[PDB]
Chain A
């Protein structure tokens, strides 16, 4: 399963470029009678379009009675939009092979999600000028009607 840094699932809030995401998986090993946690140190998760954009080694983070849980950090999605694949491929010669892939769509920044004018110190000037011109026009209309020629 993958999700936002704060737990917000994908369906609740689709992904976009430069959005912190986390990924987690679990591995279990059968030994004849019952399952147990599988402890390995070379497993890799890949986020790829047609080529790997992210390739991270999964690190042990949590445990349980029958499985062992691995997870990447809080990595930041790339700045390229498109339909990406989160895939974990465990292929160790000797053991069973396991593939888990999910195809999601990383969107682009919407016209709403951009630092507003008041947040940028570079645009205080232009907004101040717009406000000044609108207030001078408002005082000019009044003084043009009120006064006589």
Chain B
């Protein structure tokens, strides 16, 4: 199966990707919409 340090890396990667997509979305929406 998958070990623990791998699931930790996976959780952290999911979180980072989520928070980066959220920041990009907010920037796009705030710059291109009054």
Asked if A and B touch directly (CB within 8 angstroms), the answer is: no
Instruction: Give A residues with C-beta under 8 Å from B.
Output: none
Instruction: Give B residues with C-beta under 8 Å from A.
Output: none
